[PDB]
């Protein structure tokens, strides 16, 4: 699993803007989504991403695992992720 090779990232402070060069679609991510995206850029696997989120936010692990699962799936549906 990895970020698609056709995607370019724009970092504006806390948030991230994504552009897909093939589909020509662009996206914005909120604070938590961008944190996850940064970890994906660093090549972190989901388990490591879950660890990072739980260490920085006041939240139970099952909630994080469930939300991450939904989030990655949403990314993949927009072809922002591949091999997921």
């Amino acid at each position: 699993m990895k970020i698609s090779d056709a995607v370019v990232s724009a970092h504006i402070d806390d948030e991230v803007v994504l552009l897909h060069l093939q589909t020509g679609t662009y996206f914005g991510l909120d604070a938590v989504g961008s944190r996850i995206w940064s970890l994906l850029e660093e090549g972190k696997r989901p388990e490591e991403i879950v660890d990072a989120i739980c260490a920085e936010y006041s939240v139970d692990r099952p909630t994080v695992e469930r939300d991450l699962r939904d989030f990655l799936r949403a990314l993949a549906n927009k072809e922002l992720l591949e091999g997921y």
Partner: peptide
């Protein structure tokens, strides 16, 4: 280590 959590969101804002 104690930030307020909200579920990650992907928002599509447009296209070429």
């Amino acid at each position: 280590m104690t930030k307020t959590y909200t579920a990650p969101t992907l928002v599509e804002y447009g296209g070429l």
